[PDB]
Structures are given as structure tokens and as C-alpha cells.
Design an enzyme around this catalytic site. Structure first.
Site, PDB file in Angstrom:
ATOM      1  N   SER A  78       0.812  -1.214   0.000  1.00  0.00           N
ATOM      2  CA  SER A  78       0.000   0.000   0.000  1.00  0.00           C
ATOM      3  C   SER A  78       0.847   1.266   0.000  1.00  0.00           C
ATOM      4  O   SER A  78       1.797   1.394   0.781  1.00  0.00           O
ATOM      5  CB  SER A  78      -0.906   0.004   1.230  1.00  0.00           C
ATOM      6  N   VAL A  90     -15.287   4.440   5.422  1.00  0.00           N
ATOM      7  CA  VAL A  90     -15.682   5.820   5.160  1.00  0.00           C
ATOM      8  C   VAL A  90     -17.100   5.924   4.627  1.00  0.00           C
ATOM      9  O   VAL A  90     -17.665   7.028   4.613  1.00  0.00           O
ATOM     10  CB  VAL A  90     -14.700   6.514   4.192  1.00  0.00           C
ATOM     11  N   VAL A 144      -6.970   6.333  -0.010  1.00  0.00           N
ATOM     12  CA  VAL A 144      -8.190   5.529  -0.079  1.00  0.00           C
ATOM     13  C   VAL A 144      -8.907   5.853  -1.374  1.00  0.00           C
ATOM     14  O   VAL A 144      -9.091   7.026  -1.710  1.00  0.00           O
ATOM     15  CB  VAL A 144      -9.119   5.807   1.126  1.00  0.00           C
ATOM     16  N   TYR A 166      -9.083   4.376 -17.109  1.00  0.00           N
ATOM     17  CA  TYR A 166      -9.159   4.954 -15.780  1.00  0.00           C
ATOM     18  C   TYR A 166     -10.543   5.542 -15.518  1.00  0.00           C
ATOM     19  O   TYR A 166     -10.976   5.604 -14.362  1.00  0.00           O
ATOM     20  CB  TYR A 166      -8.064   5.994 -15.622  1.00  0.00           C
ATOM     21  N   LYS A 186     -10.579  11.643  -9.339  1.00  0.00           N
ATOM     22  CA  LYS A 186      -9.321  12.297  -8.977  1.00  0.00           C
ATOM     23  C   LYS A 186      -9.329  13.782  -9.366  1.00  0.00           C
ATOM     24  O   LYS A 186      -8.742  14.615  -8.658  1.00  0.00           O
ATOM     25  CB  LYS A 186      -8.135  11.553  -9.617  1.00  0.00           C
TER      26      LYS A 186
HETATM   27  N1  NAD Z   1      -0.745   3.091  -9.150  1.00  0.00           N
HETATM   28  C1  NAD Z   1      -1.193   3.208  -7.890  1.00  0.00           C
HETATM   29  O1  NAD Z   1      -1.181   2.267  -7.088  1.00  0.00           O
HETATM   30  C2  NAD Z   1      -1.655   4.497  -7.523  1.00  0.00           C
HETATM   31  C3  NAD Z   1      -1.174   5.613  -8.209  1.00  0.00           C
HETATM   32  C4  NAD Z   1      -1.589   6.907  -7.893  1.00  0.00           C
HETATM   33  C5  NAD Z   1      -2.504   7.092  -6.867  1.00  0.00           C
HETATM   34  N2  NAD Z   1      -3.024   5.987  -6.156  1.00  0.00           N
HETATM   35  C6  NAD Z   1      -4.011   6.239  -5.038  1.00  0.00           C
HETATM   36  O2  NAD Z   1      -3.372   5.853  -3.825  1.00  0.00           O
HETATM   37  C7  NAD Z   1      -4.407   5.609  -2.843  1.00  0.00           C
HETATM   38  C8  NAD Z   1      -4.094   4.244  -2.191  1.00  0.00           C
HETATM   39  O3  NAD Z   1      -4.202   3.180  -3.147  1.00  0.00           O
HETATM   40  P1  NAD Z   1      -3.095   2.001  -3.240  1.00  0.00           P
HETATM   41  O4  NAD Z   1      -2.613   1.919  -4.639  1.00  0.00           O
HETATM   42  O5  NAD Z   1      -2.102   2.140  -2.139  1.00  0.00           O
HETATM   43  O6  NAD Z   1      -4.028   0.716  -3.060  1.00  0.00           O
HETATM   44  P2  NAD Z   1      -4.223  -0.092  -1.682  1.00  0.00           P
HETATM   45  O7  NAD Z   1      -5.205  -1.172  -1.974  1.00  0.00           O
HETATM   46  O8  NAD Z   1      -2.922  -0.434  -1.060  1.00  0.00           O
HETATM   47  O9  NAD Z   1      -4.901   1.007  -0.784  1.00  0.00           O
HETATM   48  C9  NAD Z   1      -6.307   1.233  -0.930  1.00  0.00           C
HETATM   49  C10 NAD Z   1      -6.855   1.457   0.463  1.00  0.00           C
HETATM   50  O10 NAD Z   1      -8.198   1.985   0.306  1.00  0.00           O
HETATM   51  C11 NAD Z   1      -8.919   1.357   1.344  1.00  0.00           C
HETATM   52  N3  NAD Z   1     -10.390   1.490   1.170  1.00  0.00           N
HETATM   53  C12 NAD Z   1     -11.123   1.197   0.093  1.00  0.00           C
HETATM   54  N4  NAD Z   1     -12.407   1.457   0.390  1.00  0.00           N
HETATM   55  C13 NAD Z   1     -12.470   1.913   1.657  1.00  0.00           C
HETATM   56  C14 NAD Z   1     -13.490   2.311   2.444  1.00  0.00           C
HETATM   57  N5  NAD Z   1     -14.718   2.274   1.921  1.00  0.00           N
HETATM   58  N6  NAD Z   1     -13.304   2.751   3.704  1.00  0.00           N
HETATM   59  C15 NAD Z   1     -12.009   2.779   4.213  1.00  0.00           C
HETATM   60  N7  NAD Z   1     -10.964   2.357   3.381  1.00  0.00           N
HETATM   61  C16 NAD Z   1     -11.215   1.933   2.130  1.00  0.00           C
HETATM   62  C17 NAD Z   1      -8.500  -0.050   1.009  1.00  0.00           C
HETATM   63  O11 NAD Z   1      -8.990  -0.989   1.975  1.00  0.00           O
HETATM   64  C18 NAD Z   1      -7.014   0.097   1.122  1.00  0.00           C
HETATM   65  O12 NAD Z   1      -6.654   0.227   2.467  1.00  0.00           O
HETATM   66  C19 NAD Z   1      -5.722   5.665  -3.653  1.00  0.00           C
HETATM   67  O13 NAD Z   1      -6.188   7.012  -3.661  1.00  0.00           O
HETATM   68  C20 NAD Z   1      -5.225   5.358  -5.026  1.00  0.00           C
HETATM   69  O14 NAD Z   1      -6.189   5.836  -5.951  1.00  0.00           O
HETATM   70  C21 NAD Z   1      -2.577   4.689  -6.484  1.00  0.00           C
END
Ligand code: NAD
Ligand code: NAD
Ligand code: NAD
Ligand code: NAD
Lengths: 272, 78, 272, 272, 272, 78, 78, 78
Positions: free
Chosen positions: E18, E64, E91, E154, E161
Site C-alpha cells: 500500500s 468511510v 483511499v 481509468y 481524482k
Molecule cells: N498506481 C497506484 O497504485 C496508484 C497511483 C496513484 C494514486 N493511487 C491512489 O493511492 C491511494 C491508495 O491506493 P493504493 O494503490 O495504495 O491501493 P491499496 O489497496 O494499497 O490502498 C487502498 C486502500 O483503500 C482502502 N479502502 C477502500 N475502500 C475503503 C473504504 N470504503 N473505507 C475505508 N478504506 C477503504 C483499502 O482498503 C485500502 O486500504 C488511492 O487514492 C489510489 O487511488 C494509487
């Protein structure tokens, strides 16, 4: 210390209010071996003591309009340091007449001076020193919101900063394949020695303080820490970026407001 | 000129240009008599307005040439 | 006709593939009284017949690097037209060596040529002709996505276009209080006579065609109609704008994809 | 006439001050066959006479929150028009409480209403009518600078417009391969019936008038002509674009200034 | 240590891949007192051991979408920590069907889920915890280039976003007058547990690696260090910013090229 | 109320709500007695402030309920 | 050279440089013998590749000097 | 199935789901017999493809249900 053992060349210190100084000082507190340059003898008087204070004997001459200064600067760095991990390009200039009134009034020679000194010198400095850069090296220049938005009387220097930010993008591509990074730090207005060359800078500084999200001007320390970050391995996934250190001011599409339960009022309209 | 004001302005100019207070007289001029470039002066001006909370506007800033000018200006605006 | 009775000066026609020509032609079909300029006698041979075709006897010499050409151009316009409602600044130049390889390699003299010819000439041309502009006048220049994004080998010309777009913003402020508008049209790549000076333009043109939302390159007519719009009273609320006419290409953050029910595939990977 | 014989569906007319009306009227003057929709019976009273005036018997019910209205709207268009060359999506809504005070205060239900009504309805409307679109069709929505810059009290509607502009980019990709275009017109503030729902709109309108490059607010005609352009084949190389029709206001990074030979002064500080 | 004695709430850890974990880990190495939340019991199994490893007994439930979880989370933080210096909102969620194919296909319910979970939760979380924030507090969320550029499949998450980045701007204004900062870190694609929900993420990851200036994907450590920076007092002049940590990828307007003395070639076209 | 002012305001309200002037009396209320929704009123308010160069602020706008209110307000501010 | 190919290329060069076909001989050179600047040539090259659907690469484009070069090149690549 | 391959895949599945190797048999299924949610599986899949340098495509990923599936798949593609 996040720059312990890392060698960096600071270009643009004028006094202890220079953005370059804030950056140099923040890098010092992170353990950097610094070297400095000065425009001429009038500026050597000010650089060489400040360099001393940041524990540095390496103080070299660089007038970026003198093509002939660059080979000596290369040789000096190779002799005394052997390699560089970062370079700070904190340098800009335009004749007084161009930083006031309109853009339409600008002379071709004022234009050429603003562009050569403020933009092309990043090319010549990075090209000159490119053979001495270590893996992961980080090149930092300094820009201003006047590049992509209108700021009062910023005129030809807005044109220069727009080019400068574009140069950052192309240089980031050129140098990234050698695992070298290139960024711009876009500072908010800050009272410096060159910034006094801008017509009614003081009012631009006030407008920023009143209307920035954080209702403060940025501190020299805040620009230096942001710079240090971009120079350090902390930002080793950041390149081609224009990083705003401006108390949030860039987000504002209009003057800030504040409500008296009745109307809304511009914050500006409260103090006078 | 008020003597307390002059002496306090004189210390600033002294320290700023690393000259002896003795050489800082109301007639003295920063470029000619005090050995100040365009930076020294601009740095010195900021030191003064920062010290005195006032701000020398840029139009008034140019018209300064001598120690008396900065002193007579500051006394009129503090 | 949306420019009936409106007088405009077209700067930059080279042949009937020039962006300036497309614009001039679209304005003609909207009833504009046109006047044209030419770089030198080699170019007068090509401008003056095309001008003829667009029903124009007004053909003047303008090499924007010759300061001495501008007062005569002013006098010519005042004699023959008396006033202007729009100006098309469709002009750029850089030495071959700069439009290839890296930005780091660029010579100071190539830099100065790209900036003077491609950016500063908008200032000198608009300043020169400012006394002759009518209420509601509209000033148009030509830019490229290479200004704010990296495009292959675009190098110093990206720097110039970034400045150029910044000049548009400042000029829009300078001139807007006199109810004059200033815009940039940011065309997609289009096969023109100067665009052959760009290293592997052909591949940039292909990449655009494959990956643009509309899966086509833009037509000379499409740039001309967009230009006409910006020159016409239809756009009298538009100023300081960079208007993309590029088949939508600017929106792409990556190569286009297409799905075979199985994987996704880059469109680029289908033809070869 | 640039839309002679072209069929278009205007969504969002409320009265003759609606942005949708300006657009519809400009398209009419270019020879378009129009059709209109109305929220409910309270709004049918106002749409159907205006439609009459623009020579249109085609007036349909569309509350975009009623999923069940869309199949009937499809059938109506197929019956009466058979095909569409353009669609105007001029619709947004948020509860009063959300367009004032802070974003932090916003209720989840106000959020969902602003997003569904103001953004998702473009998806459902374009998806519903996609089978009836002709070659070269053009889909237009309406946005505001509050999407990418802070504007006072615009709050959740800034969030909606940011999404809306992002939807334009993705829809431009989705639809571009079928040679259909999708754009946003980003109007400057303009006194309309929904814009009265914004807290201290009047002050936002004034701030714009004083500080825009052209020192005027935009006219309903100016938004309509810009819209017409984007709907017409004149813009057939334009897609995915956010087109500012705001008297140039977007370029300003700060309040406008004006000089009295002495200081610079904010224009705002002259009238009061 | 730049966060010694500073209390922070990490929202979004799923496992040690994560983004939230990288950030939490970087903050730990800078001396932060951390607290963590988990979606449900399935996720508590994974958070609570990782929290342990980062020296933390404070592990709270937060779904959330459950309005009723927020008052308990407030009480827990007040009991155990008393105050917060930073909050990480890491999240996002959308149903599988929406992260593939077109935007046009998206269901209203998928839309509402993507918006509520991915955007509105920043409002409710920051509003809930606002009374407990210390002077200089720093709120960080996570975004992606898909917000302002098209990225393959996406779709609705680009819309979310875009809103999210707009929320950052408004929240930065709302909270800045209380000297609280709000930023987005825009990471490059990185193999995480949620990122597997994106159709052909793998190809997006490859396209990034080949075409980014630094010819590498970003490391989890690189995102964490960038995050730490934005959470720390090092960035106390930075607010309202979208900070790209993407190996420079955002600067590319086209595929990367490389020259064989002959033609130019897309880098993509070398490996296959 | 000034009779010239009332009659002129009465014509605006009449035309705006397409009622007969006769039904426009100072006691009448736009929602109840005049059949005006939330749009009619907002449109009518703009018609008035545009006509009279003044601007009814939004806080004062809500507190209006009857013809007399708009008349007594406009007379106090024109 | 194939005579049909040469004649067809010859018409293009003729029209492009507004010379008589007679002066367009395989030995002739665009700069020297045909009075072509840097534009004429670039315009002429595009006319050829557009006509023949092929594309003269820029590296091969420079190395052209004479009518024979363009003819021998085009025949090898059409 | 190759016994060296199965045993090596079995250790991964064991550690990933914190079950005993003994319970990891070719017939066993991650959801039913091994107590794996949608995360466990996705985490486990990445562990496998990362371990084996190959990549299970998403279409092939869904169609997996049992230990044998992942084993028979990996052996066919390593
Ligand atoms: N390529 C990528 O992985 C990437 C790139 C840019 C931005 N992001 C953003 O980074 C953030 C984290 O994503 P990640 O890639 O680390 O994935 P991840 O699965 O490690 O993290 C996602 C988190 O969101 C939590 N979540 C989802 N629904 C929820 C809810 N209803 N209530 C509480 N928690 C909830 C999930 O359980 C998890 O803990 C997100 O905003 C994602 O869009 C990811
Ligand atoms: N408000 C601000 O102060 C502000 C805001 C944003 C960006 N910047 C940028 O920060 C950089 C540093 O400016 P500063 O504000 O610290 O002013 P400063 O006067 O402290 O620094 C300017 C430096 O440029 C050097 N310089 C000028 N011409 C030179 C030349 N020809 N050769 C070598 N050096 C030369 C000056 O001598 C001085 O060292 C510039 O790019 C400036 O545009 C300043
Ligand atoms: N792909 C493209 O073709 C493309 C795309 C976007 C923007 N543009 C811009 O469009 C404008 C026109 O270029 P074009 O593609 O139509 O090429 P072109 O060769 O048709 O036009 C270039 C014009 O610039 C004139 N010029 C060059 N130097 C001059 C000088 N010193 N004084 C006076 N005139 C001079 C040339 O003679 C010619 O008339 C330029 O700004 C170009 O950068 C071109
Ligand atoms: N300053 C401005 O007025 C301004 C500036 C920029 C953009 N915009 C945008 O222009 C568009 C039109 O707004 P306007 O200013 O012309 O206001 P308006 O009141 O004239 O138009 C709003 C239209 O939205 C319709 N609508 C609201 N909810 C609906 C629903 N649920 N179903 C169907 N229709 C519904 C309204 O009935 C009305 O027809 C909106 O997107 C608005 O955000 C307005």
C-alpha cells in the site's frame, strides 16, 4: 543528514537574503559539501564570507554571459570536488525598464538579456558540468507564477520563466536517461536583492500575503527546505516538476473572501 | 536633524558599509564618499526601512544621494 | 460573412501549405480585406500571387529581424488600409541543428535566433501597429503543444513557444484595456514547409494521427477555421487563450489503447 | 449558415437569460434545426414558448435524475428528428447550503446531488443518445474556472466541474474514434437564473469585470457564439478542449494594476 | 528526525505494498507517532500487525461509507493522542466494471461509489478531525495523472481524482486560515493491491517505465519519502499543490524517442 | 408608498407573472396570492433591481414576501 | 531509368520550378542548373513523395543533388 | 505436475495464507478450503508471478479456483 557526503554547486548567492543562500543553508544543515560561484569581484566580497560560514573553501567566478568562464569552472570543480551530486541555478536578470510598464515597450536588447541570463544559462551551465555529474544527480532552478499567469509588471521576466519551465521539461528528458533529475522550484514573492528590481514588488508581496491560503508570505527557510528536498534523494522520483512553494497562492482564481454573516467581503478590503 | 535619530541611522550605515562611524557624516554620499555600489545601497535601504517599519518608496529611493537625505527622509516619515 | 469589411494583416505566408494561408483563406471566405507580408524577394515571389488570389494588392516586405522594416510597414498600412481589425503572426524559425538532438547542445546564437524570430517579433509587430488598431481588434499567434509538454527534438522551439504563450497572456492584459484581444492557436502537427525543419516530423505526425482522440491529423482548413474564429467577433469574449486545434491530442496522457476482448493493446502496436 | 440542416438538442433552457438560450439562439442564426428539453411542467411553461421563437416544435421532458426519462427522449428524437449533429448539456445544480460557507460543511447528500445532476448526467445523456449521432457530431457542456482554481463559495460545484472537465477528456477519447467531438465551454460569470444560487455571485461578477483583461463581463451573445463555434464544423479539429469565454480572466494571477506615475495601484482600489 | 513528536493518522493501509504503508514507513523513520485505521475485520488482520511493526498500538475502525464510524474515530484519537499533526488519506474504490471499457458505460451507482469513497471521504474525514488538528497540521491525499489527462480505462476514477484535486484547492483555502495545509501527491503507477483492479494496469506500468524521463517506475520508498516531505514541516510553505512523484512522466506529450543516427525511433518500438 | 413608484413596480410584477395589474395589490404575496414559484420570484427580483439600478442583497431578498415588501424596500433604497 | 517514370517525374519538376521540360535533364541540378532555393527543393521533395506515396527520408533527402538522383531514388523505392 | 514445482508453489501458498503445507493439496480451493478473501487471492497471485517472473493475465487469473489450477498454469508458462 540527507545530503551527507553529497557535493553541490550553488550558483546565485548575493547576500544572506538570496534564495540561493536559503537553499545552500538548508543543504548545509543536511550535511552537504557546498561550492559557490560569484558574478564578479563586487559579489566575491559577499559570496566568499558566506561560503566560509557554510564551511566551504570552493568559491569560483561565473558570469554566465562570459562563455569563457565555463571551462575554468569545470576545471575548478574537477580539481577540488571531482564530481557533483546537485547544482542550484538561482540566477536571473532584466534591465529595470523591462520590469515596469508594459511588455509592448520592451527593447530587443532587454529581451535578449533577460533570456540569455535567465534561461540559456541553465543550458550552458548544465551542459558544461554534465560530464562531472554522479548517478542520481539533481539540478534545480528557480521560477515564478508569472510564467503561466499574468503578474503585474513581470513582463519580459514572465516570458523568461515560461521558457525556463519548458527547459526544465526538455532537460529532464535529456538527462533522465542518465538518471539525472531537473526541476524548478516556483517560489512565492520574497524580499530579496534582485526582487527589488520589480516595480511595486511590495504590493505584489502584500497581495500574496493577504490572499494566499496560509495568509503569510513564504520564509527564506521555507524555500530552502523545499529546495533541499528537490536536491536530495528524498525526491528521487521527482523530475520535470514545477514545485510551488508559495503559501498556496497558485490555487487562487480570485481575491480571498471573508464573511460577516451578511455579505462576503474581499479580505483585501478589510485592512484598507 | 534629531541627534538620537542621526546616531542610530549612522550605526546602521556604518555596519552596512563596514566604514567607521566617523566617516558617516550628513554630507557624505554612498556612491562617491562611502564606496557603495548599486547592491550596497539597495541592501542598506532595506536595512533602514526594515529597521524603521516604514518603507522608502522606489521613487523616493532614487532621489536619495547623501546621508542627510536618508536622515531627513526618515525623520519626516517615522 | 463574419469579417465583412474587416481589415487584417497576414504575416507568415510561405506557400499554399502555410498555416498563415489556411487562416488567410478562411478569413477571405468570411469577407475580409487582407494584406500580406513576405520575408524577402525569394518569398515575395510566392506571397504576391497568393495575395492576388485572395483579392489583395497589399503586399509588404517584413523581415522581423530588420528593425528598419517596421516603420515602413506601419506607413504602408496607414496609406493603403488606414486601420486594422486583426493581425496574424504566423512566423517562427530555428537553425536545423537546434531542432534535433538535445536541448543541452544548443548554441547561444541558435537560442537567440529562435527567441528573436519566434517570440520577440510578436512584441515588435504589435507595438509597431498598435496605433492603427480598431476597437475590438484581434491579434493571433501560432503555438504548439511542445511549449508545455515534451515533444521529440522540439528543443529550443519548445522554449520559444512557452515564452510565446506567456507573451500572449501579458499582451492580452496590456491590450485588453484598449479592447484589443490576443490569443494563441496551438495547432497539431501539420505538414508545412517550415515543419520539415523538425527532425522526424513525420513520426510525430504519425504518432499524433494514431493517438489523437479523432484518429486523424488536423487539416489546413481546420486550423484556418479555428484561426478565423479567433480573429472574428465570434470570439469577442476570448482573450489570453491557448486554443488547441489538434484533433484532441492534448488530452492524452499515454498512447491510445484498443481491446481485443483479451488484453488491451496500444493502437500503435497494431499497424507495426 | 454554418449549421444549416444540422439537428441539435438543447438541454438546460430556463429563460432567455440561460446560457443554453444564448447558445441555442446563436445556432439558430446559423440555420440549425433545434429541439429542446425541460425539467418539469414549471419549466415547460418557459421552454416551449422560447422553442417556438427559435422555430421549434420539438420540446421534450428531461429530468436527468429520472432514469426513466431517457428512453422516451431517445424515442422522441428518433421519431421527430431521426438523427442529431450536436447536443448542448447546459445543466447543473447544488443545494443552496453547499454554494456558501466552506467545503468542509458539505453534506454527503448535497455532494451526491451536485455530482449526479452536474456531471453524471452528461454520461447518461450522451450514452442514451449515442446511437442517433451523425458523423462529425459535437457534444458541448458548460464549465467554470472554479474547477481548477479556487473561487469564493463555489465549493462542491468546483468539485463537480473538475470531474466534468475530466469527463470531457475521457468522452472525447471514447467518442472520437467514431468521429464525434466533446468539449467544454468555460464561461466567465454571467447573471443567470441558477447563478443567483451562488453566495455573493454579484461580487464575483464585479471582481471579474474589474480584473479581466478586457475590463468587461462576458455577454450572453459572446457565450452563445463561442458555443455555436464549438458545435459547428468550424471547430472540427477541436476536441477534449476547455475553451475559456471569460473576457480573458483566466490569465490573471493577481488583481489588475494601474499606474499613476507614482505607485502601482490595484484597479479594485480605485472605485472604492 | 523531521517528524519527532508529531502525531499522524494513516488511513488506507492494506498490506506492505500500500502507498499508505510507504508513507507511514517514511514518517516512522522520521520519528512520527503513528495511528492507523482499517476498513473492516478482514483488513484489521493486516493493519494491526503492520502498525505493531511501526511501533503503534492505535488501530481504529474506519469504513468511510459508514457515517457512524467517524464520531468513534474522533473520540479514539482524542483519548489516545489528544491531537494530530498530519493525516494521510490514501483511499479510493470503484467497481471492477467501471475501471474497464468506456466511461459511457458507467452506471450511476458505480459513479456514486467512486465519488463517495474516493473524494467525499476526504471532506468527512477532515471535517470530523478538524477540531483536533494542531498548528501547522498537514493533510495529504493521493491522486493520479488520470485526473487531468486521459489514461486507459481509468474512466470514472479520473473523474474522481479531478474532483479530489479540486477539493484539495478548496480545502487548502478553508483550512489555510487556521494554518493547516492540504496537498495531493500524484504518484506514478505502482503495483499495489487496489491497482490490480485497473484493466491492463500492467501495460500502463510498462508504458510509464519505458517513457518516463528516468526510464524507471517509481518505488514505494519514493512515494513515501515524497509523502513524508509533504506531511513534514519541510513543506510548510506548500499547500494546494499536486506534487508529481512519477519519474517525470507527466512532462511527456508523446512517446519517448531514441536516435540511431538514421531515423528517430520510439523507445517502445525497440523492445517489441 | 409613493403612487408613481407603486404603479411602476406594479407594471413590472404584472408583466413578470402575467397577472392582471388589478390582482397586484400591496397585500398580495407572490407565492400564495400570485402563483409564483422559486424561479418566478428570482426572475422578478432581477427585473426589479435591473430596472432600478439598485441591487436587492440576498439576505434582504429572502425576507420579502409581499408586494408591499418589495415596494417599501425599493422606495427606501432607490 | 524507366522512360515512363522519368517523364512523369520530369513533369512534376517542370511545373514545380516553372521551367520548361526541355531544361529538365538527368544531369541538371536544382540549385545550380534549375534555379531552386532551399524552399523550392523542399516543396519539390514533398510534391514527389506525396505523388508517389513513398517518403524520401531526410538523410536521403540531403544526398540528392541532381534530377538523376531523384529519379534513380524514386525508381528504387516506388 | 512436477514435484519440485508443486512443492515450491506449495510453500508460497502456505506462507501467504498462513496455513500448514499439509492443508495445501492440489484439490484445495483458496476461497472454500483455504479461507482466502478477494485480497488474499490477489496478494497470492502477485507473489506467484513475481516469484516466477511470468505474469498471470487477468483473464487467466479469474479462471483459477484451486491449487492444481495455479500449479498446472505455472508449469505451462514458466
Ligand atoms: N498506481 C497506484 O497504485 C496508484 C497511483 C496513484 C494514486 N493511487 C491512489 O493511492 C491511494 C491508495 O491506493 P493504493 O494503490 O495504495 O491501493 P491499496 O489497496 O494499497 O490502498 C487502498 C486502500 O483503500 C482502502 N479502502 C477502500 N475502500 C475503503 C473504504 N470504503 N473505507 C475505508 N478504506 C477503504 C483499502 O482498503 C485500502 O486500504 C488511492 O487514492 C489510489 O487511488 C494509487
Ligand atoms: N520573489 C523572489 O525573490 C523570487 C521569487 C521566485 C523566483 N525567484 C528567482 O530566484 C532566483 C534568485 O533570485 P533572488 O530573488 O534570490 O535574487 P538575488 O539577487 O538574491 O539572486 C540573484 C542572483 O543572480 C545573480 N546574477 C545575475 N546576473 C548574473 C550573471 N550574469 N551571471 C552570474 N550571476 C548572475 C545575481 O548576482 C545574484 O547572485 C532568480 O531566478 C529569481 O528570478 C525570485
Ligand atoms: N506542425 C506545424 O506546421 C505547426 C504546428 C503548430 C504551430 N506551428 C507554427 O505555425 C507558424 C507558421 O509555421 P508553418 O508551419 O505554417 O510554416 P511555414 O513555413 O508555412 O510558415 C513559416 C513562416 O515564417 C516566416 N519567417 C521565418 N522567418 C522569418 C523572418 N525572419 N521574418 C519574417 N518571416 C519569417 C517564413 O518565411 C514563413 O512565411 C509558426 O509559428 C509555427 O511554429 C506550426
Ligand atoms: N456564471 C454562470 O452563469 C455560469 C458560468 C459558467 C458556467 N455555467 C454553467 O452553465 C450551465 C447552465 O447554467 P446557467 O447559468 O445558464 O443557469 P440556468 O438556470 O439558466 O440553467 C440551468 C439549467 O439547469 C437545469 N436543470 C437543473 N437541474 C436539472 C435537472 N435535474 N434535470 C434537467 N435540468 C436541470 C435548470 O432547470 C436550467 O434549465 C451550468 O452548467 C452552469 O454551471 C454558468
Amino acid at each position: 543528514g540527507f545530503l551527507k557526503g553529497k557535493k553541490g554547486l550553488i550558483v546565485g548567492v548575493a547576500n544572506n537574503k538570496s534564495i540561493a543562500y536559503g537553499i545552500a543553508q538548508s543543504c548545509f544543515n543536511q550535511g552537504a559539501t557546498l561550492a559557490f560561484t560569484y558574478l564578479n569581484e563586487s559579489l566575491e566580497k559577499r559570496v566568499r564570507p558566506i561560503a566560509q560560514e557554510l564551511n566551504s573553501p570552493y568559491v569560483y567566478e561565473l558570469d554566465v554571459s562570459k562563455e569563457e568562464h565555463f571551462k575554468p569552472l569545470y576545471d575548478s570543480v574537477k580539481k577540488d570536488l571531482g564530481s557533483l551530486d546537485f547544482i542550484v541555478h538561482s540566477v536571473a536578470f532584466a534591465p529595470k525598464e523591462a520590469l515596469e510598464g508594459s511588455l509592448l515597450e520592451t527593447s530587443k536588447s532587454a529581451f535578449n538579456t533577460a533570456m540569455e541570463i535567465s534561461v540559456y544559462s541553465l543550458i550552458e551551465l548544465t551542459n558544461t558540468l554534465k560530464p562531472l555529474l554522479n548517478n542520481g544527480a539533481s539540478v534545480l532552478t528557480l521560477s515564478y507564477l508569472g510564467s503561466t499567469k499574468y503578474m503585474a509588471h513581470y513582463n519580459v521576466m514572465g516570458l523568461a520563466k515560461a521558457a525556463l519551465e519548458s527547459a526544465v521539461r526538455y532537460l529532464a528528458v535529456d538527462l533522465g536517461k542518465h538518471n539525472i533529475r531537473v526541476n524548478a522550484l516556483s517560489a512565492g514573492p520574497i524580499r530579496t536583492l534582485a526582487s527589488s528590481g520589480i516595480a511595486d514588488f511590495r504590493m505584489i508581496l502584500k497581495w500574496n500575503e493577504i490572499n494566499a491560503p496560509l495568509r503569510k508570505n513564504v520564509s527564506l527557510e521555507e524555500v530552502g527546505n523545499a529546495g533541499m528536498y528537490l536536491l536530495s534523494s528524498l525526491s528521487s522520483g521527482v523530475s520535470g516538476e514545477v514545485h510551488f512553494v508559495d503559501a498556496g497562492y497558485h490555487v487562487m482564481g480570485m481575491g480571498a473572501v471573508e464573511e460577516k454573516d451578511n455579505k462576503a467581503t474581499l479580505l483585501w478590503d478589510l485592512h484598507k | 536633524s534629531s541627534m538620537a535619530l542621526f546616531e542610530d541611522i549612522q550605526a546602521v550605515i556604518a555596519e552596512q558599509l563596514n566604514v567607521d562611524a566617523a566617516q558617516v557624516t550628513p554630507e557624505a554620499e554612498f556612491v562617491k564618499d562611502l564606496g557603495a555600489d548599486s547592491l550596497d545601497v539597495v541592501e542598506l535601504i532595506m536595512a533602514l526601512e526594515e529597521k524603521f517599519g516604514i518603507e522608502i518608496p522606489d521613487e523616493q529611493a532614487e532621489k536619495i544621494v547623501n546621508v542627510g537625505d536618508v536622515v531627513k527622509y526618515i525623520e519626516d516619515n517615522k
